[PDB]
Amino acid sequence: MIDLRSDTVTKPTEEMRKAMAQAEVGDDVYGEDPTINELERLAAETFGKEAALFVPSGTMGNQVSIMAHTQRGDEVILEADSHIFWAEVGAMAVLSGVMPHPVPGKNGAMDPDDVRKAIRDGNIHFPRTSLIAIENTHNRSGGRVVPLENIKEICTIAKEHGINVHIDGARIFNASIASGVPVKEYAGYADSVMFCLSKGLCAPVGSVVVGDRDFIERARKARKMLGGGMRQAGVLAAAGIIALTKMVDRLKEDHENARFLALKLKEIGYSVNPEDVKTNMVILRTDNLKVNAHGFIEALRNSGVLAEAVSDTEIRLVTHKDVSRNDIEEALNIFEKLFSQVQH
Amino acid sequence: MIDLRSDTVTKPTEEMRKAMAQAEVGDDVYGEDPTINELERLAAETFGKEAALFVPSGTMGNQVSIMAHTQRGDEVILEADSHIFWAEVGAMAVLSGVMPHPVPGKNGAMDPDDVRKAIRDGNIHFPRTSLIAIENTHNRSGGRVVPLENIKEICTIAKEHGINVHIDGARIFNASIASGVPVKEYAGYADSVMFCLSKGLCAPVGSVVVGDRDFIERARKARKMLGGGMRQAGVLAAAGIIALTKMVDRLKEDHENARFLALKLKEIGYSVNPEDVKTNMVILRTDNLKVNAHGFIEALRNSGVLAEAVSDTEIRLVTHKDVSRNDIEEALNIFEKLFSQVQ
Amino acid sequence: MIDLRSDTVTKPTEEMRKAMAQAEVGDDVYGEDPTINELERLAAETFGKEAALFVPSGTMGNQVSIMAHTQRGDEVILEADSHIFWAEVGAMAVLSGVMPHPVPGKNGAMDPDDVRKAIRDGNIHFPRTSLIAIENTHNRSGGRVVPLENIKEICTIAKEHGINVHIDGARIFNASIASGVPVKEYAGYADSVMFCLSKGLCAPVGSVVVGDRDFIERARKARKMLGGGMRQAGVLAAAGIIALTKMVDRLKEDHENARFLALKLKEIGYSVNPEDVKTNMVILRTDNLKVNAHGFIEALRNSGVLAEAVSDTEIRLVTHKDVSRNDIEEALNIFEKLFSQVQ
Amino acid sequence: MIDLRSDTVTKPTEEMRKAMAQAEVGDDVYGEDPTINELERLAAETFGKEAALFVPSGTMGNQVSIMAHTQRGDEVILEADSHIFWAEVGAMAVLSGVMPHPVPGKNGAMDPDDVRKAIRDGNIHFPRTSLIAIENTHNRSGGRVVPLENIKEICTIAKEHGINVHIDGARIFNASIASGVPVKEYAGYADSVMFCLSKGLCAPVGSVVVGDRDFIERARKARKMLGGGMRQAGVLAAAGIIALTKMVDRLKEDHENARFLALKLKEIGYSVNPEDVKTNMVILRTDNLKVNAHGFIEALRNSGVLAEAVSDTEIRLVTHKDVSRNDIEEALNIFEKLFSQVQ
Numbered sequence A: 001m002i003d004l005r006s007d008t009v010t011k012p013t014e015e016m017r018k019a020m021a022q023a024e025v026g027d028d029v030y031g032e033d034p035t036i037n038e039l040e041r042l043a044a045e046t047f048g049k050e051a052a053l054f055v056p057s058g059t060m061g062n063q064v065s066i067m068a069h070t071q072r073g074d075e076v077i078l079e080a081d082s083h084i085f086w087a088e089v090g091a092m093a094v095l096s097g098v099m100p101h102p103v104p105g106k107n108g109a110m111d112p113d114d115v116r117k118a119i120r121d122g123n124i125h126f127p128r129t130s131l132i133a134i135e136n137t138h139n140r141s142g143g144r145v146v147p148l149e150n151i152k153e154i155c156t157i158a159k160e161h162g163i164n165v166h167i168d169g170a171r172i173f174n175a176s177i178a179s180g181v182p183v184k185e186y187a188g189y190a191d192s193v194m195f196c197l198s199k200g201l202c203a204p205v206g207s208v209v210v211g212d213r214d215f216i217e218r219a220r221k222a223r224k225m226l227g228g229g230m231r232q233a234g235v236l237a238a239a240g241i242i243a244l245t246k247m248v249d250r251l252k253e254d255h256e257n258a259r260f261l262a263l264k265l266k267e268i269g270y271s272v273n274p275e276d277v278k279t280n281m282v283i284l285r286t287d288n289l290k291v292n293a294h295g296f297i298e299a300l301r302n303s304g305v306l307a308e309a310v311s312d313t314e315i316r317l318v319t320h321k322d323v324s325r326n327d328i329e330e331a332l333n334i335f336e337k338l339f340s341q342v343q344h
Numbered sequence B, C, D: 001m002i003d004l005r006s007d008t009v010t011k012p013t014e015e016m017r018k019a020m021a022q023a024e025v026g027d028d029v030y031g032e033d034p035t036i037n038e039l040e041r042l043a044a045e046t047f048g049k050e051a052a053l054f055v056p057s058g059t060m061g062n063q064v065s066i067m068a069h070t071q072r073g074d075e076v077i078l079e080a081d082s083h084i085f086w087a088e089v090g091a092m093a094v095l096s097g098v099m100p101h102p103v104p105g106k107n108g109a110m111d112p113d114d115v116r117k118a119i120r121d122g123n124i125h126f127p128r129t130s131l132i133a134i135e136n137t138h139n140r141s142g143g144r145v146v147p148l149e150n151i152k153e154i155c156t157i158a159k160e161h162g163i164n165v166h167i168d169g170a171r172i173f174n175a176s177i178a179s180g181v182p183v184k185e186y187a188g189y190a191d192s193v194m195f196c197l198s199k200g201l202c203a204p205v206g207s208v209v210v211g212d213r214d215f216i217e218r219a220r221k222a223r224k225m226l227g228g229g230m231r232q233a234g235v236l237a238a239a240g241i242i243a244l245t246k247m248v249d250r251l252k253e254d255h256e257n258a259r260f261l262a263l264k265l266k267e268i269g270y271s272v273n274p275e276d277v278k279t280n281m282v283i284l285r286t287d288n289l290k291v292n293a294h295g296f297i298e299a300l301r302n303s304g305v306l307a308e309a310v311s312d313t314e315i316r317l318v319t320h321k322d323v324s325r326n327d328i329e330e331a332l333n334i335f336e337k338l339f340s341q342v343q
């Protein structure tokens, strides 16, 4: 088995396992877990923010941010293919009572003039626009990197209208590794940033939200309500400190593996665009195959390669710490074998 | 003052005023208002449905329909410029806890394959898609008529998947007058239809939802929750019975006046597309004007013509019973005057 | 028939029917209905508040008040048998996402020390308490009057904790007639008051909320979201102006008729307590009867008297404009015949 | 320092820490974490239910159960002092749009006849009662045990009305230990039970919900929505398996320590009722003391004992694994020195 379904599947390193076992813990409901308290201090420091909040998932990170940013009946501008809108169970509507206002982007980049256009006038008929969300990297387009200049302009548009900005930075360090832009400088154009520890950085559980002391307080109370108020969570935060402080640099290996994997897949004859591979994700089209995305997933699964389809004709391949160059090469040999068996 | 902001501004006819003063009434919360009961019987019968529910507004018509069709956390597929998404205060999210899934359409017509692609798989990350809403006529695109075939194909898609279909037919009679499709035939492809009395049909207050007995029963309890459970509302249903039975045919005059207004406006030189005017609405673009939409509205208001912006660069003109052909002609002179100033 | 189920069954007076007939109307979504505007102005003036908002029901009046007073997650303290909790479809939880905090009272009066104890401290486990609701008269206890001292003390607790007060004054004018306390004085200890036009004051549709202009502005937008933004609603407001200014003082008849009814019912042998009858409601117990509430209601209905059970063993009788002293004396004869048959 | 604020403060045993280091993990979003999978299997088996779901907190455990049990606008009967009502941030209203219906109890036991009268009839005005919640042990009354006969009679009432039952069993194993009722038999009277790993059973994080397969599937989707869908959560589940399988019996020591603590505190002269100490909690009154609860807490803190106020005259001490019999006696001598200073 070679698991290219997601970078979520990453397993803890031996150093994470030791640190978790011997974590200094307390009751986080009293703010007394010291390893939680230090993870949040580090995260706030790293993003140049006042405060930070550990959460058991990126989904909860994003939804406590929406709650702390909005009142009932607000509208939240977000990209039409973004995670908050497609893969968070409609939570923004049920939990926050807010409307998404989807804006089609280009590989994650919403046209700033479209964002401006989507902001609501004050009129009794209209929800109040109170939040613009930006995802970086943008998952559904293939781990694409949103330009810093795009985020900068959207921040400006938001400040000109008294609207908050949230960065869905589930994979923001990947974006940073690919662009050279430090995450402090990304975060300077947002009121809040959620980032995952449990994807490429290899922690077993959870994410962090960074922002103002005011917002984080409101998000901490939203977390209690949603059920993310844990006890001796320092057992998880120990791994998160390691993930945050020791696992960023090596994301470059994931990017190089993903680039090598795409380059070779095109040489075999698969419909991939190696020029589109910016971070740790490859998109493969089934249009020159006699199967669709789902049938190809089954052939791959049967041959020892796990991937997932993202539409009827597209599959997403994701590299991560538990996929070595040797793994990529053994996967390429499987892809090569099946290719004659799957083409049109 | 010539009012082209909306057909909502229609005032009741003297016949309506007399019927309201004489209405036989009861407490609608016990279902004992006979004028309410007769309007709902007439509305169900007109639309081919088992049952109907009077509501104080079209917005409440849409929102009790959504509540009755959905559970918390469902997604509703709707057109990206439809009234439910654009101009109903985010009620579907606040009141029903449901996620809108906007689909950009063409003149209100969502591509049915785009509707199919929007329906969610069974996956834990994904809400359940339980409703598709369609708007006819489509307001924001200029009172455009959604082709019946589009509604047919989307009703087909929904049924394959067990999804309910709501038609926001706030102006469905304008659509019927222009398309020839009887409202009963549109309604056959829907689980529920809301339509307004208080717009082109000149009633002072209210809309009706038509549908199945069970759904209407659920929608009535949603009405009670949202605050639409009134008492002797037969006073309003008396005007509504007249609106439904006596004011439909003269909608062709609003359409003729709208067409005349648009052809003449184009001749003056405004950015209008008369070939797009099929009902009672005209969209005028300001790309060839000194002013934007909001500056033109102010200039028009100054000159005694009331209009409304639908975007930064588009104004909406609406005709109705209280705009006569002479009103249109007088408004065209005003529109003529201000053209040399604003070009 | 004689209808003692509720005072909602009141029919418009001839004066009202005339007023509705020639109401001067406009589109209330533009704030252009001159009769709505006058009704709101008179309502604000009558209660000593900056502004007012007409709504199609008292339920909508309470729920837009709650929405405008609160944010998601807040707690609302309210009497454990109040209408907002018992008879408003759980709307406060669905619409505003707010937690009721029920506090048992004596005939509507929550002990202020229990109110103060129900207020949440600043802790992450706890909702913020943002609203206290007081109902006057109190429906479920039988039209009981909350003493002005109770309102004052609760108002004082509220101001010292930063909490708003809403009076559910659906029947506030019945309370004012019984206690002699003018409605402005009650309303001076609240941030908002909802009062009904469609019960004892005999309008066919509607209630009004009064309060500060900012709150009213918020509640108007909640009204739009809930479906209460109507068009030429001056037709209803015309009746509501007569209800507000001219129908209050004759409420004393309804109280005299209620107590006459209650004294004669006890004399006959029914389990009523006429000393408890302060406004237009009488509660009759079925303890000494062969039937329960629902059984008694069926027998009464079969004999021409409509009443309403309020528990398994309690029934409610409500007097109103359409039940004269003559109507009462007849109903008492039916109650006499029935007593022998059902004791 | 001696921490008597709560049993939530328990730290992982050495064994737990070893298992955490070497837990086999997988991605739980894919159902692929074998240690999670085994914990859920063990939990379902211990309670005699079809399925189980690990969650990051008991708060999430209760709220996903409420979500899976209810539709919007439903009503939930629960005890007026229960955790879901007082200390879960109003989540049932925001997340589920449901109203609580508080029924006061005696030490967590709602009178079954009071649960009867709290159920709603079918009427358009009323929410639908869909859930009854019982808390065992009952926290705010001081860890009292709800009699199994109270649970069986309420289950009986629930089955008679189509109503689901949820047991908030945060401290259910404390109840089983003090009562001799196996948790499997408690669980037989409920559709679902939530119980905490992270209080007295000493795991660092998390709770478990058990119920039927379809319920748990619905609650797993609610978990995803609320943000409790974690990845390699087997690290947490490794300690949870130890908590569930090896930490239950020694809860007897916390009960012994609590009784010993309380008995000796009374000998010293504090206002404690040792007979009321049924599990691991001691309630102490400030009636015979200079200070209120908040004063006494601060004085105990400066002296090296952490405790919590549960009211303005009541304080709560909680025994747990990390309080030895030595810790207890060191705390007793601190309570001695303070007594004259507050008597």
Ligand SMILES: [Ca+2]
Residues within 6 Å of the ligand: A007, A008, A009, A010, A011, A197, A198, A199, A202, A203, A204, A205, D231, D232
């Ligand atoms: Ca991971």
Ligand SMILES: [Ca+2]
Residues within 6 Å of the ligand: B007, B008, B009, B010, B011, B198, B199, B202, B203, B204, B205, C231, C232
């Ligand atoms: Ca009208």
Ligand SMILES: [Ca+2]
Residues within 6 Å of the ligand: B231, B232, C007, C008, C009, C010, C011, C197, C198, C199, C202, C203, C204, C205
């Ligand atoms: Ca009436």
Ligand SMILES: [Ca+2]
Residues within 6 Å of the ligand: A231, A232, D007, D008, D009, D010, D011, D198, D199, D202, D203, D204, D205
């Ligand atoms: Ca613990």
